[PDB]
């Protein structure tokens, strides 16, 4: 029934919803279990740092392309430029992504330098021999954090030529909107001698 001045509600509770109620009573228990699992895995793989090194990539879409973030793995071109094979990089703790491609030089150099830093800061134990002392560092991400590149200086000179950025945007929008009809018009005008 409808009465009084109230917003129209859309509470979706017309199915057997009480059969599928999940209450996360186990939030604390699962946090403890995750911490125990991490401690167990760290002990099992010691002294490896519990996570692979990840590349820096640009987030897609207009909403997020202003930010960089960790990607899945380094490209084959990036690994080759760093001077090692993908098969060996995967064995020395480098995530490798065969399906990502490089079209951005700044990203490519950033990831190559990231691999150079990793290889400079890494110690690889010989396959057969006496291992030297090495304390376990747990986080490659904390050791090699992702940094947002600097886009501009803090302050500089005003260089104005009176081009009216608003007019620039208007004219770009108009040029795109009328690009097709102008091409057609030029096509028939060219055809008519």
């Amino acid at each position: 029934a409808i009465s009084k001045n109230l917003p129209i509600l859309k509470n979706h509770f017309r199915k057997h919803w009480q059969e599928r109620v999940k209450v996360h009573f186990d939030q604390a228990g699962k946090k403890v279990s995750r911490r125990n699992a991490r401690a167990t895995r760290a002990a099992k793989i010691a002294p490896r740092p519990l996570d692979l090194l990840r590349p820096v990539v640009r987030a897609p879409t207009v909403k997020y392309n202003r930010k960089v973030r960790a990607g899945r793995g380094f490209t084959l071109a990036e690994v080759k430029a760093a001077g090692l094979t993908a098969a060996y990089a995967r064995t020395i703790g480098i995530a490798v992504d065969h399906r990502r491609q490089n079209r951005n030089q700044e990203i490519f150099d950033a990831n190559v330098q990231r691999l150079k830093e990793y290889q400079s800061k890494i110690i690889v134990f010989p396959r057969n021999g006496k291992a030297p002392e090495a304390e376990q560092v747990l986080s490659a991400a904390a050791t090699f954090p992702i940094a947002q590149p600097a886009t501009d200086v803090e302050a500089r000179a005003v260089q104005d030529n009176g081009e009216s950025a608003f007019r620039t945007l208007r004219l770009a929008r108009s040029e795109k909107k009328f690009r097709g009809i102008r091409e057609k018009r030029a096509r028939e005008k060219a055809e008519a001698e």
């Binding site: 029934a1 409808i2 009465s3 009084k4 001045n5 109230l6 129209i8 879409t61 207009v62 909403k63 997020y64 202003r66 886009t151 501009d152 200086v153 803090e154 302050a155 500089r156 000179a157 005003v158 260089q159 104005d160 009216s164 950025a165 608003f166 620039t168 945007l169």
Partner: protein, 148 residues
């Protein structure tokens, strides 16, 4: 808590506040939005005009991220400079050394012109700008550079 509810006060009183005649029942007028066009019409038309019918055209598979464009007014433009360089820039308004404000980095898509910035030159980098916002920035002595 239950001890503060009118249910405790209604103990001993027959109808529990629901009335002897009206006599609280299950769904006397229907369930949910039943009767919006028939017997709840007056409430619908008085409190929710425009509820029934279609307006406009559909957009199949609309992605809200395409329309991401948060707005920043000129009167808040100077809050994108951290306060500890803010006063240093406010005094000595210099054309040769004017602060650069990257509004996209701050998380904005378009600069709007609610107006009255101080008469100090600034380089405002934005994806979009309103005509009045650009005129006020240029009047203050700055410039808008377009970025993507």
């Amino acid at each position: 808590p239950s001890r503060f509810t009118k249910t405790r006060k209604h103990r001993g009183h027959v109808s529990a506040g629901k009335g002897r005649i009206g006599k609280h029942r299950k769904h006397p007028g229907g369930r949910g939005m039943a009767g919006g066009q028939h017997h709840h019409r007056i409430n619908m038309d008085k409190y929710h005009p425009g509820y029934f019918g279609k307006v406009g055209m559909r957009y199949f598979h609309k992605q809200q991220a395409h329309f991401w464009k948060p707005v920043l007014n000129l009167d808040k433009l100077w809050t994108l400079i951290p306060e500890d360089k803010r006063d240093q820039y406010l005094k000595s308004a210099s054309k040769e050394t004017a602060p650069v404000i990257d509004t996209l980095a701050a998380g904005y898509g378009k600069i709007l012109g609610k107006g009255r910035i101080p008469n100090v030159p600034v380089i405002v980098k934005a994806r979009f700008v309103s005509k009045l916002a650009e005129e006020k920035i240029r009047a203050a002595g700055g410039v808008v550079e377009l970025i993507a």
